[PDB]
From a paper:
Ferlins are ancient membrane proteins with a unique architecture, and play central roles in crucial processes that involve Ca2+-dependent vesicle fusion. Ferlins, such as dysferlin (FER1L1), myoferlin (FER1L3), and otoferlin (FER1L2), form an ancient group of C2 domain Ca2+-sensing proteins present in almost all eukaryotic lineages. The top arch of the ferlin ring, composed of the C2C-C2D region, is rigid and exhibits only little variability across the observed functional states. In contrast, the N-terminal C2B and the C-terminal C2F-C2G domains cycle between alternative conformations and, in response to Ca2+, close the ferlin ring, promoting tight interaction with the target membrane.
To understand how ferlins are organized prior to membrane recruitment and to clarify which conformational rearrangements accompany their membrane binding, we obtained additional cryo-EM structures of Ca2+-bound soluble myoferlin (residues 1–1997) and the closely related dysferlin (residues 1–2017), at overall resolutions of ~3.2 Å and ~3.5 Å, respectively. In the lipid-free state, both ferlins adopt a generally similar ring-like structure, formed by only six C2 domains. The rigid Fercore module is well resolved and has a similar organization in both ferlin structures, including the C2C, C2CD-FerA, and C2D domains. At the same time, like in the lipid-bound state, the anchor loop of C2E wraps around C2F, ~40 Å away from C2E’s β-sheets. As a result of these multiple contacts, the C2F domain appears surrounded on three sides by C2B, C2E, and the poorly resolved and dynamic C2G domain. For example, C2E’s contact interfaces with C2B (~252 Å2), C2D (~347 Å2) and C2F (~235 Å2, excluding the anchor loop) are equally small. Likewise, in the lipid-free state, the C2B-C2F interface involves a relatively small number of residues (~193 Å2) and is not present in all the imaged particles. Finally, the C2G domain, which is flexible in the lipid-free states, binds the reconfigured C2B-C2F interface on both sides to close the myoferlin ring.
Numbering used by the authors: 198 to 384, 390 to 467, 493 to 915, 1047 to 1095, 1126 to 1401, 1448 to 1508, 1514 to 1779
The structure:
């Protein structure tokens, strides 16, 4: 057996606009398909498996078709085409795998003009039982470096285009040298780097000229690339290196030149610029030891510090094909036209720090630093040093687990002045369509909560009208006037034309949606990719504003970072929507460690900041955004010394009488005066010994509160406030060009928060017993609490409300209503020995309720619990964050207490549970796989549903008796009525192996728990009589014989007998961690409501008629009638078919009764076997092909599971006749008489026993009375008829649904086509247990 593995990963630049791509995968005739995605660039990560049993000389002949289609709402999928490749190519590859290779899409004739898309494809062909070399991860480093399958027939792309990438200059490049060559002259440190740009695209690398010792270089060069005009590679890797002779060239930073943000399928050649592109990487401070964060320099990771920026412009000639003229200087007219794109404007930044919580370290002082680009870097040397950093703060303990900062009403303020290009003509568009995208996403989630919650139809209709009218209103946003702005690029005009086209298209289709349709459920498919169209309109290659990187410094060591993209904080005069989302508004920001892509086990700090950025020509209107009152304190001091036992101001050598805090620099009260926009407030007062004297042991040393024995020097304090005087206002803090500025809040607001932590699911097992002991640290700003520990559970139910009182948060309540701070839950595994282990983190926002009219009861939601990178479980939590009014009167009623100071989740927020009886018919396990290459001998079954546990009796010998002695199990579980909150059912299988081990050899998951609430009078004559094929009314039919029924499909496909699976519903098991087939457990579940009183015992069982559950030896008799339309297997164009049967240890090969040269073989043959049931349940019937000289080919095969035939409630073990007869061809072969079968089916159906009459003429059964004269009226009777009671009871058995005699017609399947009809044939099978005695006479 050979195996084909196919994986689809990604699609990029698929042709056509407004497309909904989907991929159909076909391997060797077996065809499936993927899901439907949105947009131009879908991501799939779908995997499919296939198996064929071809010869090794025939395996390479088949092809792999990965054909792609364009899905439509009202039409069928339209073919796009694909480059199919044979199996010989992937088998010819080293390792037998073309692995993560790209693939082309093609029109079969129009592929010469360009490809129709690209699809990332993984191939592997290997034998069965083998394993692959490992594959994982998502990355974009390998693209278009001949990874795409080249030389497809007549479909090579246009490799004639030349990328005219002009590079102009660069600025602010950080120091990448040790500066030893310059500091020996004792002097210039900011300009020592040797930048060159390694351009890289599709595996082609050209290096530009070197400029030595210039952090503001001027290249003015043209670099030429020769690529295909359709190219899968999305971005050019612009990576500035530092050139060095004695060592490998270090990496300054990496930015990317994205093309498909401009492209339309209407479209043009790739263009860009002239626009600056910002680099990011390691912190700018050079170290003599090699840099630990050098991985972030090469683009791996998002970068933690700004590393300069570079002005480039991309043009494209469809000509010039340059082999050797790869580097030419820029002509001078492009040099004076590029000065219009370098025009600087002054910018102003202010950051008010609101909170900095969830700290774990308490040792040594903390601070923060706000820097944009190079401005604000506290380690860079510059004249007039900026107030770019907050003051030092010492964290205090919140009482329970974490630490917070004592900032309280006095918030730190960081103010700095920068110089950037006025690219606000672009970022106005970026911010406005991002506001469109966020409004559309919020309204989409409103529609999603409407359709999931089943709101009334008028509410859903007015919500959808609000959606459509929102797009109607603000899609009329005119793009900014790109004339008179000197920095407008050619890409700006092309992108503006494309955006106007797309915006007018979605606008007119929004009028169409408003005027043609009312179907709110069909139109959301087009809204959901209108949202993706807005995503494709927002994002930019030309963002030259560097990110506001806001750091955390522990002493002098940089510890944690974040970066805000500066477009959502930039202010502009064009409008509020054209301004940023977080412009002048608070935001919750989780800082990360530098090497961490996302925060892992420990968040360093939950920093909350309010950053405003904008042009300094329009910084006058800070006063609309401003909150509180900005305040600066002027400083001077006075030193005294204890000489001759008395304090005095004289004798201060090295200091002054009036001076600064260290005493070294002389100061006076009027040395610093309030500048323009400022006036003095109040008067110089002592700010505290109650006199204010602070004493130290040495001169200019650390002062403290009171004079000890060793203190011989002292000082004291005076401060004077300065406040904004005129209507210059709070904007005057930019005019302080530095004294420490802080924002004073004159009003405090009280907040009361309740977190409803009900339950979790799918938590990791960090203990040795494959469970955990979870608990949660619920932290919110300057408070935290700890929940209870639920021991030995991976699906815990804490059922606990965590309550915080007196959480003081400043600012207006509308500020916290628009931007609530995050409630963070840190789940841990409680270990009684050692430190607890990190389980995960859930971040969600509380529903802020400022007053009584916002009293929405908060629904619990399954917020993800991220650990590392991936989600590792969910928690069902919510929160509410309320204005605490006067005396807490508007606060809700407290939740009840099951324990002292330990609250429960209250009645309206908890999942509404009702008590159910989950009854499990745990019967048997079939088709086991070896655990660690060792057979299974002693399995047992454990049923779990939301933490409730029941166990079954362990099987002593699986090979001998694979059936549980405990057939019926009970669980009494409070299950939620809502489908969302209701937990999945998990089954465990435990094998009694050596060493007293408890291993899991199989696990099962179930989610659809809503389900379980004259002639010779032979058989050829009777077959023709029932079929009506021959004579159709004749004298044989006029003898009144029993008539069978011919079914053209399977009995399993007959919905009348429920597929013969009702008593034995089959399920699917798994093993290990990412998997494949290990086993199958079957047995019917019955999940029905228990009575509402928990003390009341069980209701009567739904499983009350357990049969003989031990295995029984059974005699089988297989009848084969005729095959139809078989596939030829010979050189003569026909087939010579025969029968091959295997029942476990017994094999029958029906060789010498073959039928020559037919495709319709009338077999008419009788095969008798006897085998152990239900162990050998797999009855395999196959048709093979006679050849007198060659190997027998396989025509087809079908699998019949006889235990489902024997154990069915419909009794398909023996096909009953129409009327009861004792001799001839109609002889009763069943070992149980019709009346005993009637009482048996009364037992299995739960029906009462049949009340026979005194002569058998009347039988009462199943709530209905039956009579013999109803069937015997105008019915011909003949001499084989037996007793009248059995005769009548047989007609009851025929009218009640017990299976009569049939000739079924099964489907053949080959190994090449396991689901396609490889012919047809007719069978009917008889099963008789030997426990009920010997069966009747066999039939010919
Ligand atoms: Ca270097
Ligand atoms: Ca260098
Ligand atoms: Ca543990
Ligand atoms: Ca533990
Ligand atoms: Ca043959
Ligand atoms: Ca043959």
């Amino acid at each position: 057996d050979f195996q084909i593995r196919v994986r689809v990963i990604e699609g990029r630049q698929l042709s056509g606009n407004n497309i909904r791509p989907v991929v159909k995968v076909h391997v060797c005739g077996q065809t499936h398909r993927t899901r439907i995605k949105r947009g131009n660039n879908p991501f799939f990560d779908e995997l499919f498996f296939y198996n064929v049993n071809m010869t090794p000389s025939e395996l390479m002949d088949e092809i792999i078709s990965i054909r792609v289609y364009n899905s439509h709402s009202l039409r069928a999928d339209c073919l796009m085409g694909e480059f199919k490749i044979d199996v010989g190519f992937v088998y010819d590859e080293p390792g037998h795998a073309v692995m993560r290779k790209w693939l082309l899409l093609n029109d079969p004739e129009d592929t010469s003009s360009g490809s129709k898309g690209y699809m990332k494809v993984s191939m592997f062909v290997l034998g069965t039982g083998d394993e692959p070399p490992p594959e994982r991860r998502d990355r974009d480093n390998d693209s278009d470096d001949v990874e795409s399958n080249l030389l497809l027939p007549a479909g090579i792309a246009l490799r004639w285009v030349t990328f005219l990438l002009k590079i102009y200059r660069a600025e602010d490049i950080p120091q990448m040298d040790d500066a030893f060559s310059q500091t020996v002259k004792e002097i210039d440190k900011k300009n020592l780097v040797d930048p060159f740009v390694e351009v890289s695209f599709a595996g082609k690398k050209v290096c530009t000229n070197i400029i030595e010792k210039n952090a503001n270089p001027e290249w003015n060069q043209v670099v030429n690339l020769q690529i295909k005009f359709p190219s899968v590679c999305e971005k050019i890797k612009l990576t500035i290196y530092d050139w060095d002779r004695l060592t490998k060239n270090d990496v300054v930073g990496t930015t990317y030149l994205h093309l498909s943000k401009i492209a339309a399928s209407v479209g043009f050649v790739p263009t860009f610029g002239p626009c600056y592109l910002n680099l990011y990487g390691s912190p700018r401070e050079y170290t003599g030891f090699p840099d630990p964060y050098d991985e972030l320099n090469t683009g791996k990771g998002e970068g933690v510090a700004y590393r300069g920026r570079i002005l480039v412009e991309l043009a494209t000639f469809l000509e010039k094909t340059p082999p050797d003229k790869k580097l030419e200087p820029i002509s001078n007219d492009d040099l004076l036209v590029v000065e219009k794109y370098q025009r600087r404007r002054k910018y102003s930044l202010s950051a008010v720090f609101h909170s900095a919580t969830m700290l774990q370290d308490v040792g040594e002082a903390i601070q923060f630093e706000v820097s944009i680009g190079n401005y604000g870097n506290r380690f860079d040397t510059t004249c007039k040093p900026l107030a770019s950093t907050t003051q030092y703060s010492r964290a205090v303990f919140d009482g329970n687990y974490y630490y917070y900062l004592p900032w309280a009403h006095t918030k730190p303020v960081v103010t700095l002045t920068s110089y950037w290009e006025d690219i606000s003509h672009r970022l106005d568009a970026v911010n406005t369509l991002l506001a469109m995208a966020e409004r559309l996403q919020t309204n989409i989630e409103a529609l999603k909560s409407g359709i999931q919650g089943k709101i009334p139809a008028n509410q859903l209709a007015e919500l959808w009208l609000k959606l459509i009218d929102e797009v109607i209103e603000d899609t009329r946003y005119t793009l900014p006037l790109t004339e008179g702005k000197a920095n407008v690029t050619v890409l700006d005009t092309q992108i503006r034309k494309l955006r106007s086209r797309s915006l007018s298209q979605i606008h007119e289709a929004a009028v169409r949606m408003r005027s043609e349709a009312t179907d709110v459920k069909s139109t959301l498919a087009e809204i959901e990719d209108w949202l993706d169209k807005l995503m494709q309109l927002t994002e930019e290659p030309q963002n030259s504003m560097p990110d506001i990187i806001i750091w955390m410094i522990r002493g002098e060591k940089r510890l944690a970072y974040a970066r805000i993209p500066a477009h959502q904080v930039l202010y502009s005069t064009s409008g509020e929507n054209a301004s940023g989302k977080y412009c002048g508004k608070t935001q919750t920001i989780f800082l990360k460690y530098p090497q961490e892509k996302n925060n892992g086990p420990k968040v360093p700090v939950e920093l909350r900041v309010n950053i405003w950025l904008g042009l300094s020509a329009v910084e006058k209107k800070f006063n609309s955004f401003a909150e509180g009152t900005f305040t600066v304190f002027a400083e001077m001091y006075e030193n005294q010394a204890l000489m001759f036992g008395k304090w005095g101001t004289s004798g201060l050598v090295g200091r002054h009488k009036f001076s600064d805090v260290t005493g070294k620099i002389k100061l006076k009260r009027e040395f610093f005066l309030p500048p323009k926009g400022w006036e003095w407030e109040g008067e110089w007062i002592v700010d505290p010994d109650q006199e204010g004297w602070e004493y130290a042991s040495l001169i200019g040393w650390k002062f403290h509160w009171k004079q000890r024995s060793s203190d011989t020097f002292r000082r004291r304090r005076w401060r004077r406030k300065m406040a904004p005087s005129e209507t210059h206002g709070a904007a005057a803090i930019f005019k302080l060009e530095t004294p420490i500025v802080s924002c004073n809040f004159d009003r405090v607001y009280i907040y009361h928060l309740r977190c409803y932590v009900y339950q979790a699911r799918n938590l990791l097992a960090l203990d040795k017993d494959s469970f955990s002991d979870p608990y949660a640290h619920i932290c919110f700003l300057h408070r935290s609490k700890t929940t209870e520990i639920i021991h030995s559970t991976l699906n815990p139910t804490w059922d606990q409300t965590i309550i915080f009182d007196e959480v003081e948060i400043y600012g207006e309540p509308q500020t916290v209503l628009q931007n609530p701070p995050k409630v963070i839950m840190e789940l841990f595994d409680n270990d009684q020995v050692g430190k607890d282990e990190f389980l995960g983190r859930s971040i969600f926002s509380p529903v802020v309720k400022l007053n009584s009219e916002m009293d929405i009861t908060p629904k619990l939601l399954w917020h993800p619990v991220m650990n590392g990178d991936k989600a590792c479980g969910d928690v069902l939590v919510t929160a509410e964050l309320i204005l605490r009014g006067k005396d807490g009167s508007n606060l809700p009623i407290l939740p009840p207490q099951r324990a002292p100071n330990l609250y429960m989740v209250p009645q309206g927020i908890r999942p509404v549970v009702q008590l159910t009886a989950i009854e499990i018919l745990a019967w048997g396990l079939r088709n086991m796989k070896n655990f660690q290459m060792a057979s299974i001998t002693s399995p047992s079954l454990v049923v779990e549903c939301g933490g409730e546990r029941v166990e079954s009796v362990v099987i002593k010998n699986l090979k001998k008796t694979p059936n549980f002695p405990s057939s019926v199990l009970f669980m009494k579980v409070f299950l939620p009525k809502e489908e969302l909150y209701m937990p999945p059912l998990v089954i465990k299988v435990i094998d009694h192996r050596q060493f007293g081990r408890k291993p899991v050899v199989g696990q099962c998951t179930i989610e659809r728990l809503d389900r379980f609430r004259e002639e010779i009078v032979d058989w050829w004559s009777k077959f023709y009589a029932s079929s009506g094929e021959h004579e159709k009314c004749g004298q044989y039919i006029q003898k009144g014989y029993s008539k069978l029924k011919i079914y053209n499909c399977e009995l399993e496909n007959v919905a009348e007998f429920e597929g013969l699976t009702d008593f034995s519903d089959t399920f699917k098991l798994y093993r290990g961690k990412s998997p494949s087939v290990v086993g199958e457990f079957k047995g019917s579940f019955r999940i029905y409501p228990l009575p509402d009183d928990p003390s009341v015992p069980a209701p009567p069982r739904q499983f009350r008629e357990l049969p003989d559950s031990v295995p029984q030896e059974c005699t089988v008799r297989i009848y084969i009638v005729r095959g139809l339309e078989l596939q030829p297997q010979d050189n003569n164009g026909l087939c010579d078919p025969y029968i091959k049967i295997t029942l476990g240890k017994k094999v029958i090969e029906d060789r010498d009764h073959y039928i020559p040269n037919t495709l319709n073989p009338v077999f008419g043959r009788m095969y008798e076997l006897s085998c152990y049931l239900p162990q050998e349940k797999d009855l395999k019937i196959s048709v093979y092909d006679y050849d007198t000289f060659t190997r027998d080919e396989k025509v087809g095969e079908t699998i019949i599971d006889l235990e489902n035939r024997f154990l069915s409630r419909f009794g398909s073990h023996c096909g009953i006749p129409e009327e009861y007869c004792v001799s001839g061809v109609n002889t009763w072969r069943d070992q149980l008489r019709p009346t005993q079968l009637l009482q048996n089916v009364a037992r299995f159906k739960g029906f009462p026993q049949p009340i026979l009459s005194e002569d058998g003429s009347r039988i009462r059964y199943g709530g209905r009375d039956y009579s013999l004269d109803e069937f015997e009226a105008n019915k011909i009777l003949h001499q084989h008829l037996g007793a009248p009671e059995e005769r009548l009871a047989l007609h009851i058995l025929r009218t009640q649904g017990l299976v009569p005699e049939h000739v079924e017609t099964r489907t053949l399947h080959s190994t090449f086509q396991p689901n396609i009809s490889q012919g047809k044939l007719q069978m009917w099978v008889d099963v008789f247990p030997k426990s009920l005695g010997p069966p009747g006479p066999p039939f010919n």
